[PDB]
Design a protein around this ligand. Sequence first.
Ligand code: MG
Ligand code: MG
Ligand code: MG
Ligand code: MG
Ligand code: MG
Ligand code: MG
Ligand code: MG
Ligand code: MG
Ligand code: MG
Ligand code: MG
Ligand code: MG
Ligand code: MG
Ligand code: MG
Ligand code: MG
Ligand code: MG
Ligand code: MG
Ligand code: MG
Ligand code: MG
Ligand code: MG
Ligand code: MG
Ligand code: MG
Ligand code: MG
Ligand code: MG
Ligand code: MG
Ligand code: MG
Ligand code: MG
Ligand code: MG
Ligand code: MG
Ligand code: MG
Ligand code: MG
Ligand code: MG
Ligand code: MG
Ligand code: MG
Ligand code: MG
Ligand code: MG
Ligand code: MG
Ligand code: MG
Ligand code: MG
Ligand code: MG
Ligand code: MG
Ligand code: MG
Ligand code: MG
Ligand code: MG
Ligand code: MG
Ligand code: MG
Ligand code: MG
Ligand code: MG
Ligand code: MG
Ligand code: MG
Ligand code: MG
Ligand code: MG
Ligand code: MG
Ligand code: MG
Ligand code: MG
Ligand code: MG
Ligand code: MG
Ligand code: MG
Ligand code: MG
Ligand code: MG
Ligand code: MG
Ligand code: MG
Ligand code: MG
Ligand code: MG
Ligand code: MG
Ligand code: MG
Ligand code: MG
Ligand code: MG
Ligand code: MG
Ligand code: MG
Ligand code: MG
Ligand code: MG
Ligand code: MG
Ligand code: MG
Ligand code: MG
Ligand code: MG
Ligand code: MG
Ligand code: MG
Ligand code: MG
Ligand code: ZN
Lengths: 95, 69, 60, 107
Amino acid sequence: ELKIRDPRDIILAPVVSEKSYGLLDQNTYTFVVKPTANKTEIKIAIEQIFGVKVTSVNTMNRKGKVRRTRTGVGKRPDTKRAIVTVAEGDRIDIF
Amino acid sequence: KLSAAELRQLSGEELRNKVRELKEELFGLRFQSATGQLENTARLREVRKDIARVYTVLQERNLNIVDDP
Amino acid sequence: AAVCDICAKRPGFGHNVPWSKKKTNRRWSPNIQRVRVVENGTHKRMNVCTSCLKAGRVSR
Amino acid sequence: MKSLKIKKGDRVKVIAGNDKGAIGEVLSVDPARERVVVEGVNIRKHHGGIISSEAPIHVSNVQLVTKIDGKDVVTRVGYRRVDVTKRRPDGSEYAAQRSVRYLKKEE
RNA sequence: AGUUGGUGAGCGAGCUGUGAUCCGGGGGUGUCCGAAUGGGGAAACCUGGAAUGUCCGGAGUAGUGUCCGGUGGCCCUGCCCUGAAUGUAUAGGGGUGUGGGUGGUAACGCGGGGAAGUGAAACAUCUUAGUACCCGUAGGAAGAGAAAACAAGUGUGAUUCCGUGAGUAGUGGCGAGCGAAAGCGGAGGAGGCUAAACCGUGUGUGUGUCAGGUGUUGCAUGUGCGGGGUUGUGGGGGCCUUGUGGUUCUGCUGCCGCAGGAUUGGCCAGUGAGAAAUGUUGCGUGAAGGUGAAGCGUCUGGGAAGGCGUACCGGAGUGGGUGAGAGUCCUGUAACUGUAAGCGUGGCACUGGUGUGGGGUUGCCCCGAGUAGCGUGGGACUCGUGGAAUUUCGCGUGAAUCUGGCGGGACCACCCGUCAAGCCUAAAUACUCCUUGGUGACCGAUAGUGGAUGAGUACCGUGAGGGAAGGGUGAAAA
RNA sequence: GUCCGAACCCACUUCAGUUGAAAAUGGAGGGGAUGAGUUGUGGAUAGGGGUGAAAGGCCAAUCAAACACCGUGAUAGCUGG
RNA sequence: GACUGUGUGGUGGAGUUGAUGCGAGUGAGAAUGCAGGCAUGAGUAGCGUGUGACGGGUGGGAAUCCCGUCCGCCGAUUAUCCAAGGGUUCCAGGGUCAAGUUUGUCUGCCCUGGGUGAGUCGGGUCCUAAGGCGAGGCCGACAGGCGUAGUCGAUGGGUAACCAGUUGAUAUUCUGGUACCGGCUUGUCACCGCAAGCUGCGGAGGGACGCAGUGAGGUAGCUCAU
RNA sequence: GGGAGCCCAUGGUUGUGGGUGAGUGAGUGAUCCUGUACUGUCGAGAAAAGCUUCGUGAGCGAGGUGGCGGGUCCGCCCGUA
Ligand SMILES: [Mg+2]
Ligand SMILES: [Mg+2]
Ligand SMILES: [Mg+2]
Ligand SMILES: [Mg+2]
Ligand SMILES: [Mg+2]
Ligand SMILES: [Mg+2]
Ligand SMILES: [Mg+2]
Ligand SMILES: [Mg+2]
Ligand SMILES: [Mg+2]
Ligand SMILES: [Mg+2]
Ligand SMILES: [Mg+2]
Ligand SMILES: [Mg+2]
Ligand SMILES: [Mg+2]
Ligand SMILES: [Mg+2]
Ligand SMILES: [Mg+2]
Ligand SMILES: [Mg+2]
Ligand SMILES: [Mg+2]
Ligand SMILES: [Mg+2]
Ligand SMILES: [Mg+2]
Ligand SMILES: [Mg+2]
Ligand SMILES: [Mg+2]
Ligand SMILES: [Mg+2]
Ligand SMILES: [Mg+2]
Ligand SMILES: [Mg+2]
Ligand SMILES: [Mg+2]
Ligand SMILES: [Mg+2]
Ligand SMILES: [Mg+2]
Ligand SMILES: [Mg+2]
Ligand SMILES: [Mg+2]
Ligand SMILES: [Mg+2]
Ligand SMILES: [Mg+2]
Ligand SMILES: [Mg+2]
Ligand SMILES: [Mg+2]
Ligand SMILES: [Mg+2]
Ligand SMILES: [Mg+2]
Ligand SMILES: [Mg+2]
Ligand SMILES: [Mg+2]
Ligand SMILES: [Mg+2]
Ligand SMILES: [Mg+2]
Ligand SMILES: [Mg+2]
Ligand SMILES: [Mg+2]
Ligand SMILES: [Mg+2]
Ligand SMILES: [Mg+2]
Ligand SMILES: [Mg+2]
Ligand SMILES: [Mg+2]
Ligand SMILES: [Mg+2]
Ligand SMILES: [Mg+2]
Ligand SMILES: [Mg+2]
Ligand SMILES: [Mg+2]
Ligand SMILES: [Mg+2]
Ligand SMILES: [Mg+2]
Ligand SMILES: [Mg+2]
Ligand SMILES: [Mg+2]
Ligand SMILES: [Mg+2]
Ligand SMILES: [Mg+2]
Ligand SMILES: [Mg+2]
Ligand SMILES: [Mg+2]
Ligand SMILES: [Mg+2]
Ligand SMILES: [Mg+2]
Ligand SMILES: [Mg+2]
Ligand SMILES: [Mg+2]
Ligand SMILES: [Mg+2]
Ligand SMILES: [Mg+2]
Ligand SMILES: [Mg+2]
Ligand SMILES: [Mg+2]
Ligand SMILES: [Mg+2]
Ligand SMILES: [Mg+2]
Ligand SMILES: [Mg+2]
Ligand SMILES: [Mg+2]
Ligand SMILES: [Mg+2]
Ligand SMILES: [Mg+2]
Ligand SMILES: [Mg+2]
Ligand SMILES: [Mg+2]
Ligand SMILES: [Mg+2]
Ligand SMILES: [Mg+2]
Ligand SMILES: [Mg+2]
Ligand SMILES: [Mg+2]
Ligand SMILES: [Mg+2]
Ligand SMILES: [Zn+2]
């Protein structure tokens, strides 16, 4: 079958913000993931990508903001973000 | 370089390795874009185009449009 | 029933026509009879019109 | 859609507008809306700072110019078909037919 | 030779001619929902495969959670097994996956159901109108169609459509209204199959059949398949006088004849409705393209296409652009050309595939049955039940079958026409959601589509549904 | 299906409001308040039909036959232009 | 006469005049006409229950913003937390055209960025009620009606976690401490064997049920305290 | 774990490290718990699963499973402002 599936298709981008950097103090990383991926799949993908033991994965769905402009209401895409908790010393480099 | 019809001179397993390497490069590019790096933005689309090309070659081989090496 | 399982005879539609000719819609149903049949080897009921029953197009 | 008869790098003469008779090189072509930029003709300000540079003018307001006998003469163009060979993306060869522009008033 | 869509620029690229963007054609990918189809569901969500090695294949983990792909909706139908109560057997059950279906669609088609407002100066018959709407169901068109026809004294010769006939003859609470046909003039122009006798081919069963022949030779019913046959001043079968395409030379009928036979003629006939449907070669092209003529000088002007002067092209002076009004600045136009490709398409050759009757004859045999008629209750025909033909539905009743049936406006006789109760048929006709080109004593932003802009949007309504308004700087953002 | 009385449900009187705070309310009192009570969620009944401890009541703020669209540019011996 | 000048300016920036024909969406003051713009009433009524005062700050601008102090108000609710419904209004920073019945430096407004973490909470993966749909099926000219086997459907049944702390914005979710439930796997002990077990399938038990009332034993809470 | 005012200091509408001190008794008392208890009563007050147990109208399944304490990892989707 065509279309090999890579674990990097699930993990889209890291979330960079004050809360994410504060969570880095707890070995916690916030990633924007594919909105159809469950916690187990995200955990396995993170493990395979980074060679890092993951203790916990917490996910939330975030609604996109709606703003009224010329041409009416626009709606930013919905996102799901996984909050991955890493083992005591493993560390993930997001650059 | 952006890959071309010389992908038809490769084998199935190394074409699949090319797919995996392209996916990993795209992963790195997306992370750089999120983190504020990646001045070279055109590569972020060209890597996806290359993935499309490799899948095109694989599917033509699988469907026997082009004889498989 | 008003439809024959053989020949598909179905009701007609026309008029009640009184002395004053004040026409009203009405129906003419076929004389459908429900009889026991043995087709090939199958025992079953069938709604059969009296015309087919008289012609013998139904096996009892 | 196809291209225009005037291409970048050509030497053309302005035949209409505030700069009739001006001769310059075609700096850039905008085929979609048929406007070209010729050096040292339509000097106006952009934006950014001042940027005193050339503004596009309509392609029909310029004409290819040739030097026949020491005087610049505006000329029209024609095309002739010449046998060429084109390479398919894989690199194979095949003989095909291509058009080449020539200036009139000089054969 | 530029290019990474638009509203709406500069980054970072590719093309830096290794020819991109772009254009035509053909593929690849195509999340989720939707007939939606593994199961469920509040459409775009959820959830799965009893226990076994796991539904099957792959990936991952020590292992389970997991991932990727495949598979199984329902109904009809084909094939195989089984056969209930129960005996035959069927229903049913278990396989197999053979085929088809589901839903959508602007108008036009066919079949069926079927209003009311309205008009009649009320109103019920009638009208509106078989309209609106609705149900079923197509096709590129459909329906109809090869005389159980018209005609009226000769004749016409399938159907459909157009013009007349004619607002006539008629019909009508003879009110309001409704309203033909023949004939004639045109568009377009085909006719073909079948059922039945009769002859070849099995099962509820032989004891009568010169080479041959046995209580049966091949004898009796009625099947499924072949021929044969298809018409009306009757035809066909049968019975015969002949005729099949030149034969290798097989059985039967009679050591006459009949049929299978085989490369080869072959009048022919063909992808059509025509009892059928399978490759190679000859044409112009549609989708893209290619070529495509011929002007300068001065004047005023921000700007020349305007003025003045003076030349040119024209199979091209239709347009539209360009800083103002351009035949020669641009796009094109005329004319010619290319089309590789198409599922290409149309036509031709070939290939390939399929194949005769005429005359006489009545003695017999066959010629479409719950049909045609008749009665009755309704419908359509100019015809509103009538002198009511013709045609149609429901319910009864129910024929002849050639010395016969039906039609010619009740009916009967004669005469003339025709042969129903089986089927298939192109063209002329209807239509435009769409595609391409073109047009307008058509509109020009309160118009023209509701909609020149985020328009079936904003907004209103629980919902079906309703439903707007807002265009213009300049030649160039300078 | 007792009594008094909050919540709750109701709506008898009065005043105010009546271009309202409100297309039916507010202030003051008033009836029921263990019952034929009241209330939440989901569901069922549909237009000559539903439902009605019955007032022609109610069925999405005007019901002696809802609303929407269609027949439709209904018709009007009437009124206006 | 409808109207008009081949008079003369201004504005304006691309068309259009006369003759003679031809064709009309060809003329408006009325329709409680339609659309838009704008008057009249009029700087008039109103500004939606109420208690604010002051000191300081910010600012171009302060009764109406911020801080503080007095004072007043609610408190079976003017408090706190859910469901339904809403949908980013939440937080931080920038803003004062519009919106806010005034002002506004302020906002539930605008702009930009950020914010919602669950094996246990509430739903699904479990269960059914009313009711819906419904393989076959029966009924009905067509369209359809009903319904079996089933399959859905909470407002009910079933179901394992608490306290503390932390952020500008989250918390039975994160963190700390200490638990519990179901799997997988593993160590060890004990036990089976027409006759292990597992999964299906059902039987039974159980789940499993009204209203009203009194009393008793407790605890939460509250009050007081030498 | 939580819980006040004392600290060179902090920083001056601020939080840090120490400084946390007490946990006792009586009264009163629920709409909560025992409790679907108990008593009274007519109007006679869901279903199904989970659950316990029983077999076997089905298959799987090896002589391997099923139990009791101990250890490791796995625990999904939606909501959460
Ligand atoms: Mg969550
Ligand atoms: Mg978007
Ligand atoms: Mg009628
Ligand atoms: Mg009888
Ligand atoms: Mg190419
Ligand atoms: Mg060219
Ligand atoms: Mg390309
Ligand atoms: Mg599905
Ligand atoms: Mg479904
Ligand atoms: Mg499927
Ligand atoms: Mg299994
Ligand atoms: Mg269909
Ligand atoms: Mg009537
Ligand atoms: Mg009338
Ligand atoms: Mg009248
Ligand atoms: Mg036809
Ligand atoms: Mg003929
Ligand atoms: Mg004719
Ligand atoms: Mg036959
Ligand atoms: Mg030219
Ligand atoms: Mg000129
Ligand atoms: Mg006949
Ligand atoms: Mg007759
Ligand atoms: Mg009759
Ligand atoms: Mg009639
Ligand atoms: Mg008759
Ligand atoms: Mg007669
Ligand atoms: Mg036909
Ligand atoms: Mg308009
Ligand atoms: Mg205008
Ligand atoms: Mg307007
Ligand atoms: Mg709405
Ligand atoms: Mg009482
Ligand atoms: Mg209340
Ligand atoms: Mg009252
Ligand atoms: Mg009053
Ligand atoms: Mg009382
Ligand atoms: Mg309902
Ligand atoms: Mg009354
Ligand atoms: Mg009402
Ligand atoms: Mg009525
Ligand atoms: Mg009408
Ligand atoms: Mg009128
Ligand atoms: Mg009047
Ligand atoms: Mg005129
Ligand atoms: Mg007018
Ligand atoms: Mg006016
Ligand atoms: Mg107005
Ligand atoms: Mg005024
Ligand atoms: Mg005053
Ligand atoms: Mg006044
Ligand atoms: Mg006053
Ligand atoms: Mg006042
Ligand atoms: Mg007030
Ligand atoms: Mg105030
Ligand atoms: Mg204050
Ligand atoms: Mg107080
Ligand atoms: Mg109190
Ligand atoms: Mg929410
Ligand atoms: Mg915001
Ligand atoms: Mg908002
Ligand atoms: Mg806020
Ligand atoms: Mg204001
Ligand atoms: Mg502010
Ligand atoms: Mg703010
Ligand atoms: Mg289930
Ligand atoms: Mg049920
Ligand atoms: Mg069914
Ligand atoms: Mg179930
Ligand atoms: Mg459920
Ligand atoms: Mg909060
Ligand atoms: Mg907490
Ligand atoms: Mg914790
Ligand atoms: Mg039980
Ligand atoms: Mg019970
Ligand atoms: Mg007590
Ligand atoms: Mg939350
Ligand atoms: Mg909250
Ligand atoms: Zn019948």
